[PDB]
Design a protein around this ligand. Sequence first.
Ligand SMILES: C=CC1=C(C)[C@@H](Cc2[nH]c(/C=C3N=C(/C=C4\NC(=O)[C@H](C)[C@H]4CC)C(C)=C\3CCC(=O)O)c(CCC(=O)O)c2C)NC1=O
Ligand SMILES: C=CC1=C(C)[C@@H](Cc2[nH]c(/C=C3N=C(/C=C4\NC(=O)[C@H](C)[C@H]4CC)C(C)=C\3CCC(=O)O)c(CCC(=O)O)c2C)NC1=O
Ligand SMILES: C=CC1=C(C)[C@@H](Cc2[nH]c(/C=C3N=C(/C=C4\NC(=O)[C@H](C)[C@H]4CC)C(C)=C\3CCC(=O)O)c(CCC(=O)O)c2C)NC1=O
Ligand SMILES: C=CC1=C(C)[C@@H](Cc2[nH]c(/C=C3N=C(/C=C4\NC(=O)[C@H](C)[C@H]4CC)C(C)=C\3CCC(=O)O)c(CCC(=O)O)c2C)NC1=O
Ligand SMILES: C=CC1=C(C)[C@@H](Cc2[nH]c(/C=C3N=C(/C=C4\NC(=O)[C@H](C)[C@H]4CC)C(C)=C\3CCC(=O)O)c(CCC(=O)O)c2C)NC1=O
Ligand SMILES: CCC1=C(C)/C(=C/C2=NC(=C\c3[nH]c(/C=C4\NC(=O)[C@H](C)[C@H]4CC)c(C)c3CCC(=O)O)/C(CCC(=O)O)=C2C)NC1=O
Ligand SMILES: CCC1=C(C)/C(=C/C2=NC(=C\c3[nH]c(/C=C4\NC(=O)[C@H](C)[C@H]4CC)c(C)c3CCC(=O)O)/C(CCC(=O)O)=C2C)NC1=O
Ligand SMILES: CCC1=C(C)/C(=C/C2=NC(=C\c3[nH]c(/C=C4\NC(=O)[C@H](C)[C@H]4CC)c(C)c3CCC(=O)O)/C(CCC(=O)O)=C2C)NC1=O
Ligand SMILES: CCC1=C(C)/C(=C/C2=NC(=C\c3[nH]c(/C=C4\NC(=O)[C@H](C)[C@H]4CC)c(C)c3CCC(=O)O)/C(CCC(=O)O)=C2C)NC1=O
Ligand SMILES: CCC1=C(C)/C(=C/C2=NC(=C\c3[nH]c(/C=C4\NC(=O)[C@H](C)[C@H]4CC)c(C)c3CCC(=O)O)/C(CCC(=O)O)=C2C)NC1=O
Ligand SMILES: CCC1=C(C)/C(=C/C2=NC(=C\c3[nH]c(/C=C4\NC(=O)[C@H](C)[C@H]4CC)c(C)c3CCC(=O)O)/C(CCC(=O)O)=C2C)NC1=O
Ligand SMILES: CCC1=C(C)/C(=C/C2=NC(=C\c3[nH]c(/C=C4\NC(=O)[C@H](C)[C@H]4CC)c(C)c3CCC(=O)O)/C(CCC(=O)O)=C2C)NC1=O
Lengths: 26, 160, 160, 161, 161, 164, 172, 92, 98, 162, 162
Amino acid sequence: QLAPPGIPPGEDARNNQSLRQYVARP
Amino acid sequence: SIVTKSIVNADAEARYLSPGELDRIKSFVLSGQRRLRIAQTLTENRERIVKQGGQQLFQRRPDVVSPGGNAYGEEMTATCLRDLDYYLRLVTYGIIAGDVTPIEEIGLVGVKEMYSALGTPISGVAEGIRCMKDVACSLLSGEDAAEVGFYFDYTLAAMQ
Amino acid sequence: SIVTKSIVNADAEARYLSPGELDRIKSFVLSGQRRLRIAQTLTENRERIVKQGGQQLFQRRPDVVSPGGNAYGEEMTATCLRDLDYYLRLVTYGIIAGDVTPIEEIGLVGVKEMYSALGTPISGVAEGIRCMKDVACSLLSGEDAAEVGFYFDYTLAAMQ
Amino acid sequence: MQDAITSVINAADVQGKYLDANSVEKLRGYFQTGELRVRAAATIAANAATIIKEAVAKSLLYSDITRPGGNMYTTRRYAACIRDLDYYLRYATYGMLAGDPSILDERVLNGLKETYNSLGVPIGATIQAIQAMKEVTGSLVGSDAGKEMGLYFDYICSGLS
Amino acid sequence: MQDAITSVINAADVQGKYLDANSVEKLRGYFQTGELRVRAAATIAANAATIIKEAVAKSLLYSDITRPGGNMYTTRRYAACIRDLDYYLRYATYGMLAGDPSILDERVLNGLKETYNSLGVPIGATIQAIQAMKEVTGSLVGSDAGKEMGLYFDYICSGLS
Amino acid sequence: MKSVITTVVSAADAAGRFPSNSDLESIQGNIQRSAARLEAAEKLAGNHEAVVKEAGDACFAKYAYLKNPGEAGENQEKINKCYRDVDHYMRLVNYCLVVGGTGPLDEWGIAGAREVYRTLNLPTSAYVASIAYTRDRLCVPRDMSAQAGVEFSAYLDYLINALS
Amino acid sequence: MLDAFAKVVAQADARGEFLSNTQIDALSKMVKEGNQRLDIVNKVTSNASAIVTNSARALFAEQPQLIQPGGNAYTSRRMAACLRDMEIVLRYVSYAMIAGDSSVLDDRCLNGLRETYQALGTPGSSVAVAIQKMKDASVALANDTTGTPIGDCSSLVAELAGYFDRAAVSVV
Amino acid sequence: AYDMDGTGAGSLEPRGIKSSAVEKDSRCFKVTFVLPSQSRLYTFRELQNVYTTKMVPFSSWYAEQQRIQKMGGKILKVELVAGGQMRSVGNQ
Amino acid sequence: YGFSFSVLESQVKNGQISIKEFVRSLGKSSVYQKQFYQPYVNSRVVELAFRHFLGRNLSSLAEFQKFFAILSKKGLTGLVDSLINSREYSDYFNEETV
Amino acid sequence: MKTPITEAIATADNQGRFLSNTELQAVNGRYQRATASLTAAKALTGSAQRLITGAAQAVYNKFPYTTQMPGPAYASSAIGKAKCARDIGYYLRMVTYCLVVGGTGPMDEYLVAGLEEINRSFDLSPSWYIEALQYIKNSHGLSGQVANEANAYIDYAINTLS
Amino acid sequence: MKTPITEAIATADNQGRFLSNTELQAVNGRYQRATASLTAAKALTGSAQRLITGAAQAVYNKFPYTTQMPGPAYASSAIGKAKCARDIGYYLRMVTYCLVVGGTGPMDEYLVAGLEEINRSFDLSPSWYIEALQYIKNSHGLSGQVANEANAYIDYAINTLS
Ligand SMILES: C=CC1=C(C)[C@@H](Cc2[nH]c(/C=C3N=C(/C=C4\NC(=O)[C@H](C)[C@H]4CC)C(C)=C\3CCC(=O)O)c(CCC(=O)O)c2C)NC1=O
Ligand SMILES: C=CC1=C(C)[C@@H](Cc2[nH]c(/C=C3N=C(/C=C4\NC(=O)[C@H](C)[C@H]4CC)C(C)=C\3CCC(=O)O)c(CCC(=O)O)c2C)NC1=O
Ligand SMILES: C=CC1=C(C)[C@@H](Cc2[nH]c(/C=C3N=C(/C=C4\NC(=O)[C@H](C)[C@H]4CC)C(C)=C\3CCC(=O)O)c(CCC(=O)O)c2C)NC1=O
Ligand SMILES: C=CC1=C(C)[C@@H](Cc2[nH]c(/C=C3N=C(/C=C4\NC(=O)[C@H](C)[C@H]4CC)C(C)=C\3CCC(=O)O)c(CCC(=O)O)c2C)NC1=O
Ligand SMILES: C=CC1=C(C)[C@@H](Cc2[nH]c(/C=C3N=C(/C=C4\NC(=O)[C@H](C)[C@H]4CC)C(C)=C\3CCC(=O)O)c(CCC(=O)O)c2C)NC1=O
Ligand SMILES: CCC1=C(C)/C(=C/C2=NC(=C\c3[nH]c(/C=C4\NC(=O)[C@H](C)[C@H]4CC)c(C)c3CCC(=O)O)/C(CCC(=O)O)=C2C)NC1=O
Ligand SMILES: CCC1=C(C)/C(=C/C2=NC(=C\c3[nH]c(/C=C4\NC(=O)[C@H](C)[C@H]4CC)c(C)c3CCC(=O)O)/C(CCC(=O)O)=C2C)NC1=O
Ligand SMILES: CCC1=C(C)/C(=C/C2=NC(=C\c3[nH]c(/C=C4\NC(=O)[C@H](C)[C@H]4CC)c(C)c3CCC(=O)O)/C(CCC(=O)O)=C2C)NC1=O
Ligand SMILES: CCC1=C(C)/C(=C/C2=NC(=C\c3[nH]c(/C=C4\NC(=O)[C@H](C)[C@H]4CC)c(C)c3CCC(=O)O)/C(CCC(=O)O)=C2C)NC1=O
Ligand SMILES: CCC1=C(C)/C(=C/C2=NC(=C\c3[nH]c(/C=C4\NC(=O)[C@H](C)[C@H]4CC)c(C)c3CCC(=O)O)/C(CCC(=O)O)=C2C)NC1=O
Ligand SMILES: CCC1=C(C)/C(=C/C2=NC(=C\c3[nH]c(/C=C4\NC(=O)[C@H](C)[C@H]4CC)c(C)c3CCC(=O)O)/C(CCC(=O)O)=C2C)NC1=O
Ligand SMILES: CCC1=C(C)/C(=C/C2=NC(=C\c3[nH]c(/C=C4\NC(=O)[C@H](C)[C@H]4CC)c(C)c3CCC(=O)O)/C(CCC(=O)O)=C2C)NC1=O
């Protein structure tokens, strides 16, 4: 598809987030 | 058309139509929107496609129009362009039928008997259709010119 | 495949391939990316498509597995599912070939002679393929289920 | 042997004119139903034996044409029926795809009622078999597709009458 | 009579295994060139008579097979040539689409060199006609398409030798 | 065949060494330069009968005296052989672009040519009028690419430098 | 908006890694393609008016019900808005072709375009037909020589077809 | 279609020659045989050569080979000139 | 009509196939079935086959039903091969006489 | 929709106030003029096919190249001659819509807005439509204030094309 | 004026920073292409009168009504012919300015801003100027990347006219 709304595609901040500190994107 | 001879093929074989036959009747009818646009271009360009068609035909075959040629004078030259209007019409049928079946049983079956019996050089009328092909494919994009030209050269093949 | 019998059709007629034949070889090879995805779904779902295929087959035809049925016991029931693995394999060939030509000369030509000569109820094996069809089309979208189911019902037609 | 496109091209050609807006208007109408006819011809190919088995059991299975003296008594005569009913369900499938009943009278209807009178085949029971066969065909292909396939069944029944 | 897909399915079937990554790897390679082969077979159908007219005039038109005593003297014998060269340019078109030269030896090569020796047809001049016909075919369809169509011409020339 | 391979396996074979890194590096140049010089081998092949036709008549337009009796191009058969020879020199240039060096020219066309053109009384200046017309008919980004016109011309005037 | 070079760096930074030698050579061959990519972008913008007005003329021939009274493209403003949307999609597809990445195309052309056409009542299946008619009108105009040297552009034209397909599924 | 639909004994079309030929088969033999007529002496028709060598298709070799012996013929040699062996798909 | 079977006139003039082969391939051709198969009924196709591939009319009623059921199940390619492969063809014409 | 009724509502609603006599006088002038406007709308409707077929012929007699040149933009075939007379009936139908409504509102949205993007794209020339609208002005056959109400919306269309 | 030099300055001055290597490469690419563009502009200048006389005659051949019809808009008189060879020389001079500068800047400031307003007012057809530009694209005699730079600004003006 695309990125979610507002997210600049390619500059996500959840790329290599740890799983232990990962927060699910609403 | 592709619908009628895909039937009569499977008709003779005592069977129904395979996926190879029914995924192409399916593929042809979704192609039907694009076919009518292509035939619609040649429909009201017959004034230029025929008149410029006979343009290059006489420049390439001045014998047929020179005194002694079959299409000599005001009379035969009018009929000289009449046949090109015929064959340009049959190509519009073949494009909409998706096959040269309309062109086959009209203007192709036994065509050499007619033109030999009329004294017309059959090679000359083949040159006329080729001149119409360059005018026709010049009126359409590359994706279409691979079709509209595609039916002319079949008529070129059967006409010699 | 559609490529080989569109050739042997125009082969017999002493002619080349028309636009109706060459705009479909063209249309089939651009379809080839989508065909391998469909066959790739059935390739590693044979564990469920066959085992659930024989699921509904025995619930609908308990005679064939009951004592006296052709597929009775641990032995015949294994071969009872072996044939479904065969016919599920041939449908993967027909999807990639774009025709039942692979299914035609394998598992369809003279199939009634084999199963009549094996004592197997040919109507029973037809019921097995129909049960596989509902499992197969349940694994794909509507655009694909009109194809994967489309080859099964041809096998259903020729198998009775 | 003409389809809807062949019949449209013939009438537009027989006057020597191009394919105007009215000729293409029907052709667009045929291409819209092109998706419906293939799926209709798809399921009919699958359930060919099942449809004929349903029609004969629903129309003329137990009537006294089936019993001795009736027109369908001997096994050769019974086997000729389902062979005979297969053509009606098959050629009607061709008319449903071609969208034109020209193939029926070309290959089925001509010399048909004149042939059954020779053999002494009851035309009355034949049409009711096709009517019952038309009824089951509307079950499979749906309503509108049954309307299409049904439109060629009664064409056979009309001319065969 | 197998295409590239038929040959891939046969070898994958003859071992009783499914279509693994190597079998589909070649099939993807064939589908990539599917667009090139149709356009190659497109122009060859258009210029069939022109290609054969170019080959004979470039290879064996004025040689003494054309003169009296040569193998091509009488009009029946000359007319048999362009009829004969039409098959080579036609069947090579089939091999170019099917992507497999199985159709050539199935329908052209078998009993061919054994037939020309019977008639006394010169195999040497025949191959050079096909070589010249291969040279003009690379003119029309381009370089790589000529490489494809040319790959089946010398297959005919090799087996016919 | 004087080529890029047959100098690095003729000098290594006379030395008696394996193909070292100095000789594998030379065939790395046979991958970058051969992208262009096969394009001039392909355009020259697909248009050869019109190039020699446009070039071979410049032999006779410049030197019109060849059709005089007693001279070299005096009848029908000797004119067709004169167009045949420019087709030969245009064929070996197509062979030299696809080899990689001047191999098919130095063995097949050039070697012994000064002994047959003096014995048969052919003017060798008439040959280079046809080849130097082909070098100056070359439009560089229209006929081929920019680099393929360098490769095609550098075998053409090498052939001119051989005949003169 | 990030191009094909910044897409690699954005993935490496979330791993905390340097770019390895097999990744630099995959980027040095994108530079080697180079001029062939700018030849494609030059050919689809020099003809950008002709791509839209021919594919529009070929869309109401196949679907004449769009320009009948009661159709979605019958008036002057509704016809001009139809040709406007096709120029916007063709503009952003050529942005993604020069970038090597479809990021700018779905950031600011495709986000909410499907829900816009549902609100207006525009048939989004007919909008997808118009994207596909602009696709092959510019695919066929990419692989013709006409002033370019002869070579292989087959992987870049397959890349350009992917942007036209992404825009055509993100609209219905 | 093909000759193995399900026909065998006790079936409506008469029991006849059933060949194992696929849909539109493209295999053909090269056979050689003599076949004396054994009927010319009460019919008195003109005479035709009985030693023939011809290409029969795979679709109808079995019927022909079954018939050549029907009238006392002798088959001197047959071969499969065109077609493959053990070929699942591709005989079409 | 300027029709042409160049491949069949090839394989018969060389003797690669018999006249019977050339006649059978003519029967399974598409210029035939467009002529004498499509416009007619399977009933009428059987009688028109006998006038062509046998030079005579049907003889009995059982000779119809044997050859109608064959055409009923295999079409033109199954019918013409069942006439060319009969004994009555071979007694009158074997491989050389049209 | 520029109507005299809706320009009064939008004037009072810009400042959040009721309809005063500034607004009831503006919609009084629609009703006094509506007698002459509604008789022109019946007269242009009843003679529509005479005016459409007459004004399509008026373009061919002034611009004869439009029936001779080849191309999809010109009326040389029967397809282009049918799309020409479709456009003249679009211009006449908008004029009767404006006489019914009262203001230049229907032809603003349905005809004028977006028009010059269309003529530039499809290579249509706006001088053809001025010549066709010049024919309808000289041949509706009306007189008085019935003619002045009709000629105003015809001249409004000529100024947008020029 | 839009230039590869000035668009690098304007995108750094908008952000308020010094010229980095983002901007030093955009003007490095202007200097690589400048040799092809300056040979394309020297050749279009030296053959300008041939291209101006020829392109005006190429419009009178396709559209012969422009030398026939009376009125001020058409090239019927000798005054309307002189104002047409002046219009072709304006379109050609802006192309050689764009090759020298390095972008579509001089024909934006001087020709295409306000172009659709002065065509509709004085009743000029943009199809006249397209055929005058298709002639120059087919008759400049340039080759290779020299012709790629010239035909890129000719094709830019055809997109604004259409
Ligand atoms: C400490 C333990 C630890 C983990 C295991 C991972 C778990 C994990 N994986 C992913 C994220 C993911 N995980 C996968 C997994 C797979 N891809 C496939 O196609 C197969 C299903 C499978 C490969 C085997 C994919 C594709 C994503 C990316 C999801 C996305 O961006 O849409 C995410 C979301 C954040 C991100 O983008 O990385 C998390 C928390 N992270 C952790 O911190
Ligand atoms: C002057 C000296 C000189 C060389 C030594 C070679 C060096 C060489 N090899 C490969 C590159 C390669 N070499 C191989 C070969 C192999 N890989 C295997 O798994 C097999 C063991 C083996 C096959 C024989 C493959 C598969 C590639 C990558 C594909 C390719 O580039 O062709 C490449 C291209 C990729 C790269 O940049 O490294 C180069 C330059 N070329 C030269 O110019
Ligand atoms: C494989 C090698 C190969 C070439 C080198 C060319 C060579 C070449 N060019 C032309 C033909 C031509 N060549 C040119 C080009 C030019 N004319 C000039 O005077 C300028 C120097 C130059 C501009 C770039 C033009 C304009 C023509 C057509 C008219 C003419 O003959 O001059 C012809 C005659 C046949 C034809 O019309 O094409 C030939 C052989 N073609 C090839 O196949
Ligand atoms: C391998 C490459 C190769 C070549 C380069 C040529 C070279 C060549 N040319 C000729 C032979 C000839 N070459 C010419 C050519 C010319 N005389 C003229 O009028 C012009 C000046 C000029 C052509 C433009 C003529 C006329 C002959 C025949 C000589 C003769 O018959 O006396 C012969 C003698 C045998 C023969 O062909 O008859 C040879 C070896 N042939 C080759 O096989
Ligand atoms: C600023 C403006 C600008 C452009 C518009 C592009 C266009 C462009 N492309 C190439 C260079 C090239 N261009 C192509 C492209 C193609 N060849 C084909 O056969 C296909 C039809 C087409 C694919 C689209 C190829 C294949 C090369 C490589 C040159 C070669 O190897 O011959 C070159 C010359 C490079 C050189 O030779 O040194 C230029 C200027 N580059 C630019 O700098
Ligand atoms: C739809 C398929 C179809 C075709 C093609 C067709 C041809 C046809 N061409 C005719 C005549 C003719 N055709 C020509 C044609 C030519 N003279 C030349 O020099 C050229 C080579 C060539 C035309 C390009 C001439 C000169 C006559 C009149 C001959 C005479 O008066 O003796 C006639 C007799 C007069 C007539 O009824 O029109 C027919 C029927 N009829 C068909 O139904
Ligand atoms: C494709 C178009 C077409 C048709 C329809 C067709 C019909 C046809 N039906 C026949 C017989 C028959 N048809 C029937 C049919 C019936 N008995 C009944 O009671 C029912 C009413 C009916 C079944 C619906 C029977 C019993 C025979 C055998 C008659 C006999 O042996 O005397 C026969 C005689 C030969 C034979 O069957 O081999 C023909 C030719 N032929 C054609 O070419
Ligand atoms: C992110 C970039 C972006 C895009 C692409 C965009 C599209 C967009 N297209 C619109 C309308 C439209 N779009 C179309 C287009 C079509 N209808 C058809 O029948 C055809 C199949 C198809 C194209 C040929 C039409 C006819 C309208 C006018 C709808 C209306 O006014 O009712 C509108 C409504 C406002 C207006 O009238 O301009 C928006 C906002 N907006 C954006 O911000
Ligand atoms: C009356 C004397 C007579 C015989 C015996 C005969 C045999 C004969 N067996 C055939 C094929 C065959 N025969 C077999 C048989 C076998 N496969 C096995 O693994 C087993 C060892 C064997 C069964 C015992 C098979 C599989 C074919 C098909 C071959 C193929 O499709 O390539 C064929 C080819 C045509 C056809 O079947 O239609 C003929 C003509 N013909 C005759 O006239
Ligand atoms: C589809 C595969 C296929 C091929 C290729 C084929 C060839 C074939 N070539 C033949 C004759 C012939 N072929 C040639 C050909 C030539 N003379 C020359 O000098 C040239 C070297 C050559 C032309 C390239 C000639 C002259 C004859 C007539 C021989 C005669 O009358 O004795 C004949 C004899 C019958 C006839 O032509 O009607 C056959 C069967 N048959 C096939 O089924
Ligand atoms: C209700 C408001 C409204 C207007 C005004 C309108 C105009 C309009 N006229 C058009 C085409 C056309 N208009 C003409 C008309 C003419 N060409 C000539 O040479 C003649 C002189 C002239 C007739 C006066 C022609 C031939 C076309 C087809 C152009 C093409 O399809 O390329 C098109 C292009 C799309 C289509 O074919 O439908 C539009 C949008 N559409 C509208 O919805
Ligand atoms: C530098 C940018 C620039 C442009 C583009 C430009 C165009 C331009 N062309 C004009 C007139 C004109 N343009 C033409 C040209 C033509 N008419 C024809 O019949 C031919 C087909 C065609 C020429 C090939 C004519 C005849 C006029 C005079 C029209 C008039 O005076 O009403 C006018 C009206 C003002 C005047 O009388 O000079 C402008 C502003 N002026 C500019 O300063």
